[PDB]
């Protein structure tokens, strides 16, 4: 929801075209009193409480909460036997059929999320194999998230990713309250 | 709109067994969008309900209402198609089993009134439907006799139970 921006918008009675004049006088016509032909009661009139402009749904959980969510997702995969650690993502071939058959043989889920340390160093074989697959998705470590970990039945991590995730998530524990954004230089923070 | 009356002529029954009473022929015909009030047409339809084709034609030939001529034309067309397409042996061996009028698609016009005011006139149209069944017209329902009334009353008396007890 934090990225969500709904673009639904309706016109109010002020924004619907026309509708300035009073349709008929208050008294005498035997008809109901109306002030414009564009009030919400009218066909073609405004919307009383419709969606209003592009609305954002942005909010930030505490970064400690978000890191804890990542940790909980990892523990859940491990405890439910959906987490598999690899020495590397190197494949004998870039053929997607090999990857699908390997998952089927090893009884992985219908969907696999393979995570490598950085985008650049990902093996070309696994890159080619996963670029053509829909349920086998390959992401860098910096792209790991609870939603994708839950969408994919199995999570495959390399050892460098495991070390990287341990460092990053454990840093949230035992860290000070920030003095300024961590993007700024700190004594001990890369 | 609906056009089920037209389709009712296209139903084909399975062939009858030799030891089965001959199924009387049934012919459905209609005229759609007659410039006439359905309320006025209803009286002519009701009039010719249940009558033989010849009796209905005779009654309609001497009726002053505009719809009488239209109903007569519809009945003549139904007789013709009964003989040609529905294997009815005798033209006159037909009776009006059903004759009804229905609302047609109507047009709205403005009727000017006296003080810059107006009404919405409706240019009324009506449909007319007939089912013709081959055979003599069924006899009219005989009036209730005193014997039949007394029998019904005594049956009601005998139907009595001791209510709200064991």
């Amino acid at each position: 929801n934090f990225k969500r921006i709904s673009y639904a918008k309706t016109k109010t009675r002020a924004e619907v075209r026309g509708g300035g004049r009073k349709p008929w006088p208050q008294k005498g016509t035997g008809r109901a009193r109306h002030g414009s032909i564009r009030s919400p009661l009218w066909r073609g009139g405004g919307v009383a409480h419709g969606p209003r402009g592009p609305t954002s749904y942005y909010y930030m959980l505490p970064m400690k909460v978000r890191a804890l969510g990542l940790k909980v997702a990892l523990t859940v995969k491990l405890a439910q036997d959906d987490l598999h650690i690899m020495d590397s993502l190197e494949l004998p071939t870039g053929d997607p059929q090999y990857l699908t058959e390997l998952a089927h043989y090893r009884r992985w889920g219908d969907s696999v999320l393979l995570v490598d340390l950085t985008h650049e160093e990902m093996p070309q074989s696994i890159v080619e194999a996963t670029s053509r697959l829909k349920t086998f998705n390959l992401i860098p470590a910096v792209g790991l998230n609870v939603h994708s970990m839950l969408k994919h039945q199995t999570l495959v991590l390399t050892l460098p990713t495991v070390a990287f995730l341990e460092d990053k998530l454990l840093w949230q524990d035992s860290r000070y309250r920030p003095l300024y954004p961590f993007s700024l230089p700190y004594s001990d923070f890369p | 709109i609906s056009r089920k009356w037209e389709k009712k002529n296209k139903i084909v029954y399975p062939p009858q067994l030799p030891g089965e009473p001959r199924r009387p022929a049934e012919i459905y015909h209609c005229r759609r969008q007659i410039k006439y009030s359905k309320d006025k047409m209803w009286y002519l339809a009701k009039l010719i309900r249940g009558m033989s084709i010849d009796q209905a034609l005779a009654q309609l030939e001497f009726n002053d209402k505009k719809g009488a001529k239209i109903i007569k034309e519809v009945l003549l067309e139904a007789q013709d198609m009964a003989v040609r397409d529905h294997n009815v042996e005798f033209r006159s061996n037909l009776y009006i089993a059903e004759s009804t009028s229905g609302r047609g698609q109507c047009l709205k016009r403005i009727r000017y009134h006296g003080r810059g005011r107006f009404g919405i006139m409706e240019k009324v149209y009506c449909h007319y439907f007939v089912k013709l069944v081959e055979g003599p017209p069924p006899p009219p329902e005989p009036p209730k006799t005193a014997v039949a009334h007394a029998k019904e009353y005594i049956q009601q008396l005998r139907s009595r139970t001791i209510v709200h007890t064991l």
Binding site: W24, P25, K27, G28, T29 | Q105, L107, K108, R109, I110, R115, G116, R117, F118, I120
Partner: peptide, 16 residues
């Protein structure tokens, strides 16, 4: 006095 209100002509000029 309240003047009469005329409805639009198209409502009553419709044809099949």
């Amino acid at each position: 006095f309240t003047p009469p209100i005329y409805q639009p002509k198209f409502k009553t000029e419709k044809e099949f």
